[PDB]
Ligand binder design. Structure first.
Ligand SMILES: CCCCCCCCCCCCCCCCCC(=O)OC[C@H](COP(=O)([O-])OCC(O)COP(=O)([O-])OC[C@@H](COC(=O)CCCCCCCCCCCCCCCCC)OC(=O)CCCCCCCCCCCCCCCCC)OC(=O)CCCCCCCCCCCCCCCCC
Ligand SMILES: CCCCCCCCCCCCCCCCCC(=O)OC[C@H](COP(=O)([O-])OCC[N+](C)(C)C)OC(=O)CCCCCCCCCCCCCCCCC
Lengths: 74, 55
């Protein structure tokens, strides 16, 4: 069972950035497709920037957990 | 029997008085009698902070 647990954890930590980049991207794309005015767009630019920062945070977390999971003593 | 009427009262001898309430009443009655799904629908509205651009 430990092998299954480990592979699950590894795959989750590996796909975390892909999710942050793809599904939240689809949400942003829905919003872009639906919005027309200028005030809402001005306010949504900051959401896009926050998504940038969140993607970088997820990438850092994944890097940390992956260097923990792929570190061998011998 | 010579006239096309249901009763003997042919209405008032003076025209109505202008009234927002009477106008709204008549408009609502006409809308109900027509029963048209699509009245008041606005497919495109000029984008503006004002609710009704122009009017
Ligand atoms: C660098 C130069 C300076 C740049 C800054 C200049 C812009 C300053 C304005 C900033 C404020 C913007 C408002 C933001 C809040 C959200 C609202 C909104 O934006 O919607 C407006 C509009 C969209 O409106 P909408 O979608 O129809 O929806 C609502 C309506 O807008 C509105 O609803 P409505 O229709 O009911 O309102 C009707 C009425 C409402 O307004 C009025 O009734 C009257 C308003 C006038 C007020 C007059 C001032 C009052 C003075 C009083 C004091 C008098 C005495 C003192 C003064 C004496 C004078 C000597 O009319 C208006 O809406 C007027 C809006 C004017 C829009 C701005 C026009 C400028 C376009 C950009 C020019 C770019 C120049 C070249 C830049 C070069 C850069 C390299 O979008 C924009 O205007 C975009 C502004 C973008 C600014 C860009 C700045 C440059 C950045 C460059 C980026 C690089 C890429 C660019 C591509 C090209 C690259 C080369
Ligand atoms: C033990 C090992 C640990 C490994 C950890 C792995 C976790 C991090 C993995 C994330 C990889 C994501 C990279 C692919 C996504 C970008 C694709 C791309 O390049 O688009 C074409 C881009 C953008 O092109 P474009 O948008 O201008 O127009 C064309 C785009 N296409 C072709 C897609 C239509 O090409 C470029 O010109 C980019 C040049 C600028 C540099 C951009 C790279 C920085 C941004 C990504 C950083 C991600 C790593 C962060 C690591 C943080 C660690 C602390």
């Amino acid at each position: 069972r430990f092998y299954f647990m480990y592979m699950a954890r590894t795959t989750f930590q590996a796909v975390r950035p892909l999710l942050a980049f793809s599904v939240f991207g689809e949400v942003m794309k829905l919003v872009l497709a639906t919005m027309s005015s200028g005030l809402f767009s001005f306010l949504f630019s900051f959401v896009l920037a926050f998504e940038v920062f969140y993607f970088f945070l997820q990438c850092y977390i994944s890097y940390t957990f992956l260097t923990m999971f792929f570190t061998v003593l011998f | 029997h010579l006239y096309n009427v249901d009763s003997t009262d042919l209405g008032s001898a003076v025209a109505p008085v202008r009234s927002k309430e009477q106008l709204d009443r008549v408009a609502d009655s006409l809308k109900a009698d027509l029963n048209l799904p699509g009245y008041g629908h606005i497919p495109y509205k000029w984008e503006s902070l004002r609710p009704n651009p122009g009017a």
